[PDB]
């Protein structure tokens, strides 16, 4: 049943066939600038367009090196390396590495999964080449940027019941690592997702160099000069859902929010957020994950976070996105620090909205003096100072169960009401809220 091919050129015709079982032979395959052109291997982007359905593709022991210059060979258009348009396909075990750091002419995605019921399993992906690289999103991640960007994201999950499984995604690029747009029932399972960090102090130390940030006097898109004391990811979201997007299934173009996402047993390291699903609709479920050194741990809006952990070294482990947030059920372990604390947010959690049931567990005994569990109040988040992003800060919390099985202090702001707080220690619970209940329990 298995057709084996021994070159990228012989591979490409099968991508237009339904019901094929193909194996690309073990080996190293290189895509460079000379391979893009009208009589060259790749005349169009996406480079690898899986239009067929009901197919399987075996890339075991395949090292695919794509020179980032390919990102500039298709004019001012988005460049996708891999896109799946058909249904019921299985791609497995490919090792795919971006070579060099050349920025896209426009923007790039390594993998776009449209269609329905597809699965990508066992991939090892390394993402490079973007602009600017060094500032995270401080100078713009969308329209109206202070420094114009050429983003390069990793895996874009769209379509229906599409599945990312047992993948390793390393990004050294300014973009999302794994993200979901218009995806219905996407599942990310068993993946290791990793970016890298840089302090805002190191950014501000470009003063006087003529860097792009230096030439705008570090004025961020948030309305104020980049503040010292924060650790930022050079990437965007580790796993981030969007409330918009376009996808294609069965020849139908679809525009809709992501809905019913599921994330299971993922480890997320050094991204802007660990798991953020607050902007998807439907049922959100997160179980068994580990978030290390992200600016933000878990933000799913509503739904279930269970058997999950995050450290607090660079930002809070938990944050309610808006005052609308309702029904956020979470059980989160605050993990031992994976590096030295550098958390300018002055919070381990920011809680608001209503009708939440929240449990925090930890073995940490060394509590940094600036870290507390906040219910309502004015979070000192990098992106929400001085009225920036106003719906994402300074909001009320009501009818919340807070089980603080940790040593972290709790600060109940005056906009909090009907918070039912159980804690290891009550002496470090300040309550300026209304009709809040504080009871002690035995460690």
Numbering used by the authors: 1 to 443
The article reads:
FdlA from Flavobacterium sp. SA-0082 is an endo-type fucoidan-degrading enzyme that cleaves the sulfated fuco-glucuronomannan (SFGM) through a lytic mechanism.
We first measured the enzymatic activity of 12 mutants and found that eight of them (D137A, K141A, H176A, F179A, E236A, R240A, Y242A, and Y242F) almost completely abolished their activities, H279A mutant retained approximately 65% of the activity compared with WT, while mutations of Asn243, Arg272, and Tyr322 to Ala only negligibly affect their activities. However, the Y242F mutant, which also lost its catalytic activity, possesses a potential active site nearly identical to the wild-type form. This result highlighted the importance of the hydroxyl group of the Tyr242 side chain. In our docking models of FdlA-NTD with fuco-oligasaccharide, the hydroxyl group of Tyr242 side chain is located within a hydrogen bond distance with the glycosidic O atom between −1 and +1 subsites, thus allowing Tyr242 to donate a proton to glycosidic O atom and function as a catalytic acid. This suggestion was supported by a previous report showing that a conserved tyrosine residue in β-helix PL31 family members serves as the Brønsted acid.
